[PDB]
Amino acid sequence: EVQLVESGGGLVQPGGSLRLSCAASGFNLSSSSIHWVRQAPGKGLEWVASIYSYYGSTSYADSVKGRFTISADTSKNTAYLQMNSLRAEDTAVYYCAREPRGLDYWGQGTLVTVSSASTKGPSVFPLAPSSGGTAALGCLVKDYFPEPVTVSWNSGALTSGVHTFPAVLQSSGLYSLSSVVTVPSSSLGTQTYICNVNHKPSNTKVDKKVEPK
Amino acid sequence: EVQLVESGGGLVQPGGSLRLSCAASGFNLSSSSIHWVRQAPGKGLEWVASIYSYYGSTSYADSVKGRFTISADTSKNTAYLQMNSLRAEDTAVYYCAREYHVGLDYWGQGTLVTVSSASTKGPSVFPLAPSGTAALGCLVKDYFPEPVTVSWNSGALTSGVHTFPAVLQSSGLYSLSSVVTVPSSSLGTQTYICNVNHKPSNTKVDKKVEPK
Amino acid sequence: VTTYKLVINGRTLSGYTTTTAVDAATAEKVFKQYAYVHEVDGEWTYDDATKTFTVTE
Amino acid sequence: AVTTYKLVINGRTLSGYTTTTAVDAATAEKVFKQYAYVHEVDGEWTYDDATKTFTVTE
Amino acid sequence: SPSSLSASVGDRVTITCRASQSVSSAVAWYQQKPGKAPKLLIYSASSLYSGVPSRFSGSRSGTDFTLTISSLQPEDFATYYCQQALLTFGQGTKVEIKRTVAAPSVFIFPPSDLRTGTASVVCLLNNFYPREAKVQWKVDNALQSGNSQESVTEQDSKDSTYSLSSTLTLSKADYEKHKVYACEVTHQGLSSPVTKSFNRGEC
Amino acid sequence: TQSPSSLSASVGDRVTITCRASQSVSSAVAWYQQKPGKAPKLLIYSASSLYSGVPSRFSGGTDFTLTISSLQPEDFATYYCQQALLTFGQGTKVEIKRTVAAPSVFIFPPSDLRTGTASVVCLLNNFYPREAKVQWKVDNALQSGNSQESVTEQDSKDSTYSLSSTLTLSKADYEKHKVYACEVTHQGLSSPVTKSFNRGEC
């Protein structure tokens, strides 16, 4: 198989520096060029750089020239992207990818978050539901940084009707998202509904049981 | 009265440079701080820099720090914004404004700044032939930079006229449409001519449009 | 600095969170307000060999 | 630094004047001509170099 | 990108502006109308500017700062901006005037720029409310996307309608391969999706 | 960072996505398919040459084409083009066409009052099409600024959309008013539906 394993993402302040790695396996990147492509939440793809180690050629996206540097380590079969003078616009998920001759293979992606706000575990607040017909309920995952946080219900026992929404950045600088479930309201009197929340950056794991008014 | 008249806009190549002027009138810029605010086609306001002439303090927006420099010429009551290392993110209408000593009291007219490789180019005009109510217009395509202005019969016909916002093409030039809703009984009798004005390229054209 | 840990076992909330701080006493006020706003009020117990606070109901 | 030429247009349906810069009038010739061709203007061209202005008449 | 909202004359509207930090009272509010320069309405959160009417109010309640129009008037349909902390601008909010729904009238124009190398097809959606309209392109009853760019007008001053210009542009080569060109439009005010069509070349 | 263009299509329809680079890029145009969040997948390389594992039904001057002969359920995804300096096209997302569905509104009073701010949530559950307008009112005074929205990907089961909207305000201001309501506009709603609550369990 051909695999590309990325690392070196995470947090850093505006103007700070961060070095990503993309370790190649199954081939030798001297026969290959490796590309880096990023993407901000909900928007399109943007190529940022290219290196052809066997021709010593480098290329950088205009909005990146003079601040990033792409390297390749023969001995370890690893390409790097040394990012510096980082700005709040660089916050994206970065993919390393390999290229009569297309990017056939893509890495896992690694999240990069530039901002002053430091890491913070989420807060969980119940959205209490109203015998009966249809009942709605959820948990508000608020004031956490950086992304991501992932929500499950009854450790995956409840899946039908559940809608976990994308997080949104607030004026504060922290994220918040919602996860809800629509169930029959005849269940609320007896059945328990538990919101499971996971935040590895702060290694927070939480269960919030939600009960009616 | 208090007036602020800007100048120095126009074209520039990627990496090129352009220096704006905002001549102040009705006051002394030592009494006030001068700010520069821009606005991209269809988007919101963005502060970029400010100068406080009587305490010489400076501030620049992060997306502008290190590339722009704001100055003030006491004697001419004029502030400048020397923009360099310009990139496609800078293409906006730039406003000079006064804050008299909080709040920005008076604003200049605004001035077009367009960074891009494409050179200045006069527009071409193509007829949109009509056919109750009948529609017709003219497609003003492949012009650079903005703006171009369209009237009909030199403004004699205004009801039913819709001049649409320009759109950027893949080539890098703009194109827009101007249409009119008319009685189709008029087609046989009345003439309809599309008036087009592009100052950057000193082009003014009239195209007569009659049905298919 | 180093990182402290709060183990929380209340009626409705159960889990563990973290944060960094210079002294435990500073991570105490952070962990405390976290409890107050989540309506967790119980017996606090600190463990310094593990740097972990514990609120139990 | 180069020069600016000018084409005045007096056709049946199209009438006006446009611009462009160029090294030679002859380059400013191919410039204005295709502009005409694409607008379906076919007529008697007349050039004046003291004004750097072409004129196509229909 | 500006936010939008809808309100009729007489409605109460309160625009909020919040900044991550303490902006004391130094919050200014602006009004911008199409084409014209911005205009200052409120300064330092609550203090009114000279010439600003009766119905304009600014408040502070926490780190929260609000702009309120007590009774919206015909003149007031326009985009409003705030200013906070390094002075910063809020996104801005455009107040449109609410209006009964109006179906568009669709017009299709074949291209006349075939000597240019590219063929451009124009379909006109004229005077509809609300703004949201879906125009999709079909060529030989094959739905198309990418090849097209849209453009919308400001809300009309009298009848408060919207219309839309959409241009499908193709290389003459590809244009001279197909026969059927149509723009199908979906609108809330459309019982049925309307399709306007023509056959290439005189047909 | 620009959100992709959209289109709607049912199984069996023919779709031709176009991509344009400013100049002559020979044959070096590649086409990709991306499903939400996850990494892209290469379909075409050198303009026309199909890649291994891509079904038959995929086919590819300055105008370049990707064509699906007969849309299948699997093909609902965002498609990208590329120019080989390498730059990526805007992208186009294939949506699944579905009959109109009105949302179901739920309003949740705030529970985070001990936090300094008060957050009210309005729930738009399972509606089609995507376009939905949520409006906020406090004492029947419409609100703006205090609110943020978030939308789900199209469901694979019933091809639904849902939407969460959160009105956040300082507790000081929250306890000055009594009526909090979210008015919802949807094509499939004859009437704008208003869900509301009165402060203090009224």
Side-chain angles (χ1 to χ4, degrees):
Chain A
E1 64 172 19
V2 194
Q3 266 272 334
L4 301 173
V5 202
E6 313 183 34
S7 51
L11 223 47
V12 85
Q13 270 153 29
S17 302
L18 261 163
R19 176 186 85 150
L20 313 161
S21 319
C22 170
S25 324
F27 75 101
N28 37 9
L29 63 92
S30 55
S31 267
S32 320
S33 93
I34 288 197
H35 299 240
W36 288 85
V37 176
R38 69 186 179 173
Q39 184 183 230
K43 326 281 164 234
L45 305 162
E46 202 206 27
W47 171 85
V48 316
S50 194
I51 180 184
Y52 200 173
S53 322
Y54 199 76
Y55 296 176
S57 183
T58 55
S59 195
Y60 301 86
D62 293 334
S63 154
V64 158
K65 195 118 60 63
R67 320 185 295 118
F68 290 30
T69 290
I70 179 165
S71 284
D73 196 330
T74 299
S75 59
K76 320 188 148 182
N77 225 47
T78 298
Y80 309 92
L81 183 72
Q82 173 75 39
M83 310 133 77
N84 302 340
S85 148
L86 282 192
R87 329 177 273 228
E89 296 76 14
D90 301 321
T91 295
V93 168
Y94 290 73
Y95 298 86
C96 81
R98 174 191 92 163
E99 166 151 47
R101 291 112 208 184
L103 307 175
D104 69 336
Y105 274 90
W106 291 67
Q108 35 183 276
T110 181
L111 208 152
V112 166
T113 315
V114 201
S115 163
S116 310
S118 324
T119 47
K120 186 169 193 295
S123 299
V124 194
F125 300 113
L127 309 175
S130 294
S131 324
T134 285
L137 64 96
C139 40
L140 179 65
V141 189
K142 188 173 169 38
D143 288 358
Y144 74 87
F145 193 81
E147 279 196 299
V149 82
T150 68
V151 187
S152 200
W153 286 95
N154 305 346
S155 42
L158 201 34
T159 47
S160 309
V162 185
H163 291 296
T164 298
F165 297 84
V168 184
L169 242 187
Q170 303 179 112
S171 76
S172 46
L174 310 165
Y175 296 87
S176 289
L177 75 80
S178 99
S179 205
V180 306
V181 64
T182 42
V183 302
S185 93
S186 147
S187 64
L188 307 179
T190 44
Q191 171 77 47
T192 308
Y193 295 115
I194 294 186
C195 171
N196 317 120
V197 176
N198 266 272
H199 195 244
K200 209 239 305 175
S202 86
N203 214 25
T204 291
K205 175 220 149 214
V206 152
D207 298 334
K208 226 282 172 183
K209 177 195 32 162
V210 193
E211 328 163 62
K213 318 149 168 306
Chain B
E1 55 180 276
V2 194
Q3 285 280 331
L4 312 153
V5 53
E6 314 176 36
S7 51
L11 210 34
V12 278
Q13 275 275 338
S17 317
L18 214 63
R19 188 182 89 149
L20 304 177
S21 324
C22 170
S25 323
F27 74 102
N28 42 357
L29 44 83
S30 57
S31 212
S32 309
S33 86
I34 307 94
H35 310 267
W36 289 82
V37 174
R38 71 195 217 214
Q39 205 182 26
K43 295 255 221 71
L45 314 164
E46 195 216 26
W47 172 82
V48 313
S50 52
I51 183 154
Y52 316 84
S53 324
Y54 210 67
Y55 271 120
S57 181
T58 39
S59 191
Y60 299 87
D62 272 289
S63 44
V64 160
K65 189 172 288 103
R67 312 188 293 111
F68 293 26
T69 296
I70 181 169
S71 52
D73 196 327
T74 299
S75 147
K76 313 199 233 252
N77 232 44
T78 299
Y80 311 94
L81 181 72
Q82 169 75 40
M83 325 196 288
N84 307 331
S85 297
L86 281 103
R87 47 280 311 271
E89 301 97 304
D90 307 320
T91 296
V93 168
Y94 291 72
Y95 285 91
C96 87
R98 161 184 93 162
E99 166 161 331
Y100 192 95
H101 312 320
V102 288
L104 317 188
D105 173 21
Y106 274 101
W107 291 68
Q109 83 261 28
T111 186
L112 197 45
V113 168
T114 310
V115 49
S116 165
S117 44
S119 78
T120 41
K121 180 180 189 297
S124 299
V125 186
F126 298 111
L128 308 178
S131 293
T133 287
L136 55 98
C138 39
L139 172 63
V140 195
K141 192 168 159 263
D142 286 1
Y143 74 88
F144 194 80
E146 289 241 68
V148 79
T149 75
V150 190
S151 61
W152 280 95
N153 303 348
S154 284
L157 193 47
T158 52
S159 305
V161 182
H162 288 124
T163 303
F164 288 83
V167 160
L168 248 197
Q169 299 183 110
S170 75
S171 63
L173 319 164
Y174 291 89
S175 189
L176 70 79
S177 306
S178 203
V179 308
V180 68
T181 61
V182 310
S184 174
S185 57
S186 66
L187 303 172
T189 64
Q190 175 54 343
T191 67
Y192 289 116
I193 291 116
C194 172
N195 328 118
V196 182
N197 264 87
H198 195 243
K199 200 225 83 64
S201 88
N202 292 293
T203 298
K204 193 217 174 336
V205 200
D206 303 334
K207 163 56 112 187
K208 188 190 97 134
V209 191
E210 269 181 7
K212 203 170 169 180
Chain C
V1 300
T2 197
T3 324
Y4 301 88
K5 190 180 182 196
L6 179 82
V7 190
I8 175 167
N9 323 105
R11 276 100 142 202
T12 54
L13 187 66
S14 266
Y16 59 94
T17 184
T18 62
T19 204
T20 61
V22 189
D23 186 58
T26 321
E28 181 145 27
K29 192 193 181 191
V30 164
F31 285 146
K32 201 82 138 281
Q33 256 205 48
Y34 189 87
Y36 180 78
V37 302
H38 291 72
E39 201 131 2
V40 200
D41 193 57
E43 200 87 311
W44 290 74
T45 87
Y46 180 57
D47 179 352
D48 194 68
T50 79
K51 271 82 171 41
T52 294
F53 292 91
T54 297
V55 63
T56 297
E57 287 192 293
Chain D
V2 282
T3 169
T4 322
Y5 302 89
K6 185 185 181 199
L7 164 82
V8 174
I9 308 151
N10 198 225
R12 281 90 136 97
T13 48
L14 198 68
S15 35
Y17 63 93
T18 185
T19 59
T20 168
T21 59
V23 281
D24 291 70
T27 317
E29 184 146 29
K30 207 195 245 202
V31 175
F32 287 143
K33 192 171 241 82
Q34 262 208 239
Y35 189 91
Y37 176 77
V38 302
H39 287 82
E40 182 152 2
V41 193
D42 189 19
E44 222 155 0
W45 309 61
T46 88
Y47 184 45
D48 174 357
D49 198 68
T51 311
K52 325 281 172 334
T53 289
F54 293 90
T55 297
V56 67
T57 45
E58 274 192 291
Chain E
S1 41
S3 165
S4 312
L5 78 94
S6 324
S8 38
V9 177
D11 290 17
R12 182 177 217 86
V13 181
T14 300
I15 297 189
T16 307
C17 184
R18 284 185 312 250
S20 172
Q21 309 176 123
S22 175
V23 196
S24 183
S25 165
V27 186
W29 294 86
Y30 302 73
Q31 182 200 93
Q32 205 193 21
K33 273 147 134 44
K36 304 138 172 225
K39 225 156 179 219
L40 175 81
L41 313 165
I42 315 285
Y43 69 97
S44 322
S46 320
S47 315
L48 62 80
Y49 182 74
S50 295
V52 193
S54 51
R55 63 192 183 274
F56 285 83
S57 323
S59 192
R60 195 270 321 171
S61 279
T63 292
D64 201 322
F65 291 80
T66 87
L67 159 73
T68 285
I69 308 170
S70 84
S71 184
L72 192 93
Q73 299 305 322
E75 309 89 22
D76 302 339
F77 82 98
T79 323
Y80 296 96
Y81 289 86
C82 78
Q83 215 184 231
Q84 50 247 77
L86 292 185
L87 73 102
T88 63
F89 281 99
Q91 70 153 289
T93 301
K94 172 148 83 195
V95 185
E96 297 143 349
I97 300 315
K98 216 169 32 184
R99 145 88 178 160
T100 199
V101 174
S105 313
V106 191
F107 293 90
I108 183 50
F109 302 101
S112 46
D113 46 324
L114 295 174
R115 306 255 243 204
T116 55
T118 59
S120 65
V121 193
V122 178
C123 190
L124 177 67
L125 286 71
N126 225 27
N127 298 324
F128 55 88
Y129 189 95
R131 191 175 173 278
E132 275 74 343
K134 171 66 169 150
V135 198
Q136 183 92 10
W137 284 107
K138 297 218 254 181
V139 171
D140 297 330
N141 303 81
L143 299 144
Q144 311 257 312
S145 148
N147 42 31
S148 148
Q149 277 176 323
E150 296 193 358
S151 182
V152 199
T153 76
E154 70 180 72
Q155 214 191 14
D156 201 55
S157 319
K158 37 201 66 167
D159 64 354
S160 287
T161 43
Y162 297 94
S163 311
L164 180 153
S165 175
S166 158
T167 313
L168 187 93
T169 172
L170 311 83
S171 35
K172 172 184 222 333
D174 278 17
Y175 181 75
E176 283 295 298
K177 269 150 167 282
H178 323 295
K179 174 178 191 234
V180 168
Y181 297 86
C183 43
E184 185 192 49
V185 296
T186 313
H187 195 249
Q188 186 188 0
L190 281 194
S191 321
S192 324
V194 178
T195 320
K196 296 302 170 221
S197 36
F198 73 87
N199 303 346
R200 194 205 59 218
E202 298 116 13
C203 168
Chain F
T1 77
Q2 174 164 10
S3 320
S5 186
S6 157
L7 74 96
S8 324
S10 276
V11 179
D13 287 19
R14 184 181 225 88
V15 175
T16 302
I17 308 177
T18 76
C19 176
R20 298 190 170 106
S22 49
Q23 310 142 234
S24 179
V25 196
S26 209
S27 149
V29 191
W31 289 88
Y32 299 87
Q33 184 194 94
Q34 155 161 52
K35 272 153 177 170
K38 280 124 179 289
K41 291 161 109 193
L42 173 81
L43 314 163
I44 305 277
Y45 69 99
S46 310
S48 39
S49 311
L50 174 65
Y51 185 73
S52 38
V54 192
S56 157
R57 68 188 178 275
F58 280 92
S59 42
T62 289
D63 266 334
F64 293 87
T65 46
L66 176 93
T67 310
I68 309 168
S69 98
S70 183
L71 196 69
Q72 297 305 124
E74 288 53 48
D75 303 341
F76 75 126
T78 319
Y79 292 93
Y80 292 85
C81 64
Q82 203 204 190
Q83 177 250 304
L85 311 94
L86 301 104
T87 187
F88 273 101
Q90 197 241 58
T92 302
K93 183 229 63 183
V94 172
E95 168 202 282
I96 294 315
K97 196 105 85 189
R98 168 212 197 292
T99 177
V100 170
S104 207
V105 197
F106 308 89
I107 203 183
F108 301 98
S111 45
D112 61 325
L113 273 38
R114 308 247 264 196
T115 75
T117 58
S119 290
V120 195
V121 180
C122 189
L123 181 48
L124 286 72
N125 193 268
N126 294 323
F127 55 88
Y128 189 97
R130 180 176 162 94
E131 299 78 47
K133 224 142 201 173
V134 182
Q135 303 153 309
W136 273 112
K137 298 192 229 152
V138 169
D139 293 330
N140 304 300
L142 192 135
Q143 301 290 291
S144 174
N146 41 32
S147 55
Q148 278 177 326
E149 288 194 359
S150 182
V151 191
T152 55
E153 286 313 272
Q154 221 192 17
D155 202 288
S156 36
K157 308 145 208 201
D158 52 357
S159 34
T160 37
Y161 291 97
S162 315
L163 185 148
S164 186
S165 158
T166 308
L167 186 96
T168 172
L169 305 120
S170 306
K171 187 167 182 313
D173 176 293
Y174 178 77
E175 72 214 341
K176 270 182 179 57
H177 325 283
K178 188 174 198 53
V179 163
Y180 299 86
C182 49
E183 183 192 51
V184 176
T185 296
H186 197 69
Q187 191 189 2
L189 281 162
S190 83
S191 322
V193 172
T194 287
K195 288 299 168 140
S196 58
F197 74 85
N198 306 255
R199 225 199 68 229
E201 63 185 342
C202 157

